[PDB]
């Protein structure tokens, strides 16, 4: 069906892309950067974000495969020496989808504005100290002072959420997980300090105490945001989908990636 | 109903009780402790804990309910002073029923015993040095040596596992979550480090390398257990229910215990 | 003798420092803001730490009072009420003098600039990945991936290396302790973890492995540098000196300051 | 001179001896294990503690040398293939003596006895909850609720200490760092969390609150005590000295154990 290619952009990815397309070019394929169906990330984890982020919103209507050419490529599934296996096997289809949540960041001003997020949405000051109310399901639960905080979706929390000191949740559970960057804790300063794990349908809201300006970084893309009046972050009812085509357990990829391989 | 109350045995908790008691002989209730409807504890969190184990066979026939003489007291409701509102309001009854997951702890020898957990199950060694291999749904995941283990249900999370840096969880979440005691991290033993946190139906195994005798310690009831050949930790099938006349919300209640109050 | 007295600047400091001086009137005390030999903060830890730099190039020749009017006023040693007692055995002399030791920051471009600091040095990226090989005594310890590194003086450990998992050191002690900030720690990349505390003539020396550029905050004051090419960090071999005139022990500072007051 | 070799008694290690005793009969070396002046230990950090604690009574009359046969030996500064270089080194003489500080217990009850470490001293209660006192140089610092706690000497700080979350420190700082294991912290029980680290000459003194029954472990030999009244930590006046060759820096010791080799 329709499917496109995105690449890391070195020789190594890019060559893989062309011969991934010259063998799609043997079977019942179009190649549609607009409308596909699928989308194949070629490179590391990063590249994969960016192809995530490049049609968050044709969530619905994709699956995403990765290929890993990079470093680490925790969202890979493949080697690029199996490529030749992984276009026979996509061409006819009939592959199982596996979905992961995803999380769900809206700024408010004095106007929205809303981000998704596949690894996670994290806050710090512009400039000043970093100061916010943390209420929850509209009931103020801490005041948070220190360098910031981070909010990760299940498949997050192996990325900046486990630097962190956040656990590790397989991403069946909808759920999101708040981890705190440094924070004051004396006599007068406190938090909870643990982190935080929230099911769907809560609510965490983040309110300026006294500065209103904060960088937000939605995986890594971070922007400036002026004259914030709250961050509000949920459980997205948006999943991303993946196509499987072998059993790659949550829990082998994570001892891969961290234990050894 | 039927109900029955434990008590501290203090005397404030043993005259709170008597007064309860008293009280409720001006309603249709019957007091009964082999097949109450209403279990009472008044007293510590710990005394909240010998109620659920001592009627944990009867776990979905049975409503608990907190009074907090105690210190901390998580598991309470209610102070003291409101022990005659809580009577008149548990007499007629057509009060909410919420549910809170459990953990399941199997140990086999060489012979089953299962045990029921509320708030975490542990291992440690008999004396010599804790090594066992970690198997997530029959994967060999990694060599865990160190002090122990401890597996948390949601309800746990803010106990023995928050001191052990895991992350705090709402009891929403059909899940367990599994932390570290204090590992060896060099250039021949490496661990995951970070917490994790498993779903329903996610089973995991505890094999013995050398030693088989582990001291496994259920809601702080540790028991000597030889000839371990596995322990199997699950989230439970079996849920504890608990009466409630007002909103408490679980976050209120981390913030109660741990930032204010 | 020659003294001078700083002030956070509202009401409560101003009118105090006023007080001060007045009383200073009635001795053989000359305010001289140019080579005091006393120098009085009136204010919080960061009227203190401003302080100390006004003065930084006549460190042997000055001893620092504190005066909390802030919020948690770590360095202070007096309360706003005992400001006229503080005065009188000032007045006098024949105090008792304590040393505090130093860290010195040195950036290498392609030029040196020096750096002192009382609390910590601390070094992130301008903005992309933060990366740098970690060399101790010339010999290459670590490749560090992550936010950044904290290098902290003895009587800093309690301020952000506290935050970031260091350990509190007695200032009796001639060391400067290096903490991570958020670090990757996976299969291929890989840090020691563990807060790292150097003795005097230990030199620890960062140097960048692709970007160049680099935010250096010394005491809180963060400065852009670029083309960096080596930062060194050293105890200093200057000690900030602090009158003193009854005993008020660092852990009891410590235990007022975290535990209880 | 006179000299003695433990080995760890396997296989590998008895013949590594026997070896070496061959080659030291060719010179004038005479085997004393009453009155060693060189004590080789040969086998893993476990061996090389047992050889310290075979001799602490001779201590500034012994220059120790480790072997490692066994995994990690941190302890250890020669490969069993260097042997023959180290007997034939060690033959002459006029080697440099390197010494490392200790820690001196002190247990009181209700009599005293005291206990040299080379690694660490920690404390647990007999079965109940642990909870002590924690006075420094006779100020009550906190009351400590939880697993116990650890007193690391410098070059223990990369063993138990490091587990609990303690920092690396090199051994030339005459120092102890207290870490706790697993503590309770929320509104009513709170402990300093992070790890401290006393000066020679400092006292820190561990007093009973309710039970006075500990398992007291010295370089993991547990002992139980009963009838404790106090257990008082200080840096030793006593030192081990090693017999160094050749320059093996401990921070690269420390890269070898820990990042890569
Ligand atoms: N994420 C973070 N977490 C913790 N600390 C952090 C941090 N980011 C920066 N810092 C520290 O701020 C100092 C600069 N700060 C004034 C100084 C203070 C100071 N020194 C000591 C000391 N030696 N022992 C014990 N408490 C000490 N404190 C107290 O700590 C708090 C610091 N306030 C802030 O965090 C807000 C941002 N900071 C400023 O506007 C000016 C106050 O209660 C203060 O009384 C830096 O130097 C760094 O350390
Ligand atoms: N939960 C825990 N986590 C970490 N360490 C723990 C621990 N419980 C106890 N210990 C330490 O065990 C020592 C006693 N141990 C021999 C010694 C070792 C030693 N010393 C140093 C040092 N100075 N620097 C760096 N690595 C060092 N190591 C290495 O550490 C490992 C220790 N092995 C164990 O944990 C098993 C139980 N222990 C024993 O049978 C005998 C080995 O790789 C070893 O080469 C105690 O003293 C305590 O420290
Ligand atoms: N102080 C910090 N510590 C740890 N992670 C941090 C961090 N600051 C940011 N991040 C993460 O970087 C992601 C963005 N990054 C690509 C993505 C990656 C990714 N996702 C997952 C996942 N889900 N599970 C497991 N490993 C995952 N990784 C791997 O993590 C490393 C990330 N690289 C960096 O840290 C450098 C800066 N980052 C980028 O240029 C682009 C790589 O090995 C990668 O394969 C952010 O989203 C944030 O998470
Ligand atoms: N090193 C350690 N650190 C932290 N907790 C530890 C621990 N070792 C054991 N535990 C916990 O003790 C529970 C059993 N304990 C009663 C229960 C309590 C309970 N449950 C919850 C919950 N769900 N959320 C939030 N606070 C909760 N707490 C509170 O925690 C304290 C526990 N007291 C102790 O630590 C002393 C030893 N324990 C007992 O005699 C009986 C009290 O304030 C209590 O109100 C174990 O189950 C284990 O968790």
Same mark, same amino acid.
């Given at each position: 069906?329709?499917?496109?290619?995105?690449?890391?952009?070195?020789?190594?990815?890019?060559?893989?892309?062309?011969?991934?397309?010259?063998?799609?070019?043997?079977?019942?394929?179009?190649? $549609?950067?607009?409308?596909?169906?699928?989308? /194949?990330?070629?490179?590391?984890?990063?590249?994969?974000?960016?192809? &995530?982020?490049?049609?968050?919103? +044709?969530?619905?209507? =994709?699956?995403? /495969?990765? =290929? !890993?050419?990079? !470093?680490?490529?925790?969202?890979?599934? %493949?080697?690029?020496?199996?490529?030749?296996?992984?276009?026979?096997?996509?061409?006819?289809?009939?592959?199982?989808?596996?979905?992961?949540?995803?999380?769900?960041?809206?700024?408010?001003?004095?106007?929205?504005?809303?981000?998704?997020?596949?690894?996670?949405?994290?806050?710090?000051?512009?400039?000043?100290? #970093?100061?916010?109310?943390?209420?929850?399901?509209?009931?103020?639960?801490?005041? #948070? +002072?220190?360098?910031?905080?981070?909010?990760?979706?299940?498949?997050? @929390?192996?990325?900046?959420?486990?630097?962190?000191?956040?656990?590790?949740?397989?991403?069946?559970?909808?759920?999101?997980?708040? @981890?705190?960057?440094?924070?004051?804790?004396?006599?007068?300063?406190?938090? =909870?300090?643990?982190?935080?794990? #929230?099911?769907?349908?809560?609510?965490?809201?983040?309110?300026?105490?006294? $500065?209103?300006?904060?960088?937000?970084?939605?995986?890594?893309?971070? /922007?400036? !945001?002026?004259?914030?009046?709250?961050?509000?972050?949920?459980?997205?009812?948006?999943? /991303?989908?993946?196509? +499987? &085509?072998?059993?790659?357990? &949550? %829990? +082998?990829?994570? !001892?891969?990636?961290?234990?050894?391989?």
């Amino acid at each position: 069906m329709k499917y496109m290619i995105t690449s890391k952009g070195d020789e190594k990815s890019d060559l893989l892309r062309l011969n991934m397309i010259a063998g799609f070019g043997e079977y019942d394929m179009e190649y $549609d950067d607009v409308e596909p169906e699928i989308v /194949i990330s070629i490179g590391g984890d990063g590249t994969f974000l960016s192809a &995530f982020h490049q049609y968050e919103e +044709r969530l619905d209507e =994709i699956a995403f /495969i990765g =290929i !890993h050419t990079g !470093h680490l490529g925790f969202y890979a599934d %493949w080697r690029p020496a199996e490529a030749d296996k992984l276009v026979k096997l996509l061409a006819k289809g009939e592959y199982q989808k596996v979905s992961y949540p995803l999380l769900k960041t809206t700024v408010k001003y004095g106007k929205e504005a809303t981000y998704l997020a596949l690894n996670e949405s994290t806050v710090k000051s512009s400039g000043g100290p #970093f100061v916010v109310d943390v209420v929850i399901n509209d009931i103020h639960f801490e005041r #948070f +002072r220190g360098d910031g905080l981070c909010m990760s979706t299940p498949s997050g @929390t192996t990325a900046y959420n486990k630097s962190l000191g956040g656990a590790l949740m397989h991403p069946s559970i909808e759920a999101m997980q708040l @981890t705190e960057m440094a924070s004051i804790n004396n006599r007068v300063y406190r938090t =909870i300090g643990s982190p935080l794990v #929230f099911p769907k349908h809560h609510v965490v809201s983040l309110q300026p105490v006294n $500065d209103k300006d904060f960088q937000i970084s939605v995986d890594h893309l971070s /922007i400036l !945001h002026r004259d914030v009046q709250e961050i509000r972050y949920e459980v997205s009812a948006k999943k /991303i989908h993946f196509a +499987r &085509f072998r059993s790659f357990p &949550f %829990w +082998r990829r994570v !001892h891969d990636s961290f234990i050894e391989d």
